[PDB]
């Protein structure tokens, strides 16, 4: 599938293998991967995510199709719920025949994703979720009301 929403930590080994096999089956020459890994900050146990799935799907589908028009396959996976320290919460791949478009979409996608994907992050501390307000990004049209 183009967008994968996974409960808990991503199986990056399995995802990376599948993506590469696709790269080879499509005779691709360039393969760009990003993996977001939960790191230990202070003494958190990990992170937790909420996802607006319907909007995430449509938002991402526009990026997937913009990529396809340029000969690039763009796919992603993201965790839902708890992800512990050392585990992966987000992964994306941009691959194609040539490195130039693949690398450009990769950069552009990741930046857009950070600021616009409808996903909410919480620090896991003491088995409690603390919303990460200071680090968060207002969506377009914030403060409408």
């Amino acid at each position: 599938a183009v967008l994968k929403i996974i409960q808990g930590a991503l199986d990056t080994r399995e995802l990376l293998k599948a993506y590469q096999e696709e790269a080879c089956a499509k005779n691709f020459g360039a393969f760009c991967v990003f993996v977001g890994i939960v790191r230990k900050e202070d003494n958190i146990q990990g992170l937790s995510f909420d996802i607006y799935e319907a909007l995430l799907k449509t938002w991402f589908e526009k990026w997937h199709h913009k990529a396809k028009d340029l000969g690039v396959v763009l796919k992603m996976a993201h965790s839902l719920g708890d992800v512990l320290i050392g585990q992966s919460s987000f992964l994306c791949v941009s691959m194609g025949k040539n490195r130039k478009n693949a690398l450009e979409l990769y950069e552009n996608f990741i930046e857009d994703f950070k600021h616009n994907a409808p996903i909410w992050k919480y620090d896991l501390i003491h088995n409690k979720r603390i919303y990460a307000k200071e680090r968060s990004h207002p969506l377009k049209g914030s403060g409408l009301l």
């Binding site: 607006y52 616009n116 909410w120 990460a132 968060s136 990004h137 969506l139 049209g141």
Partner: protein, 63 residues
């Protein structure tokens, strides 16, 4: 209309310019209305009809 609250917002979804004023009187939302974007039927806006669902989206941080 239905009103749904995503992410950190505490309020439970319910079914109650005249949408603004009513949400502006709920105190669990004073923290939020200044920074929340809105989706009408899963589409961000910046008209209304029966069964319309309105979603409040606080600042995001995927990754």
């Amino acid at each position: 209309v239905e009103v749904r609250f995503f992410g950190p917002i505490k309020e439970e979804n319910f079914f109650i310019k005249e949408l603004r004023a009513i949400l502006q009187e709920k105190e669990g939302l004073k923290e939020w209305l200044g920074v929340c974007a809105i989706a009408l039927n899963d589409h961000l806006i910046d008209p209304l009809k029966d069964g319309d669902v309105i979603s409040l989206l606080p600042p995001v941080c995927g990754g």
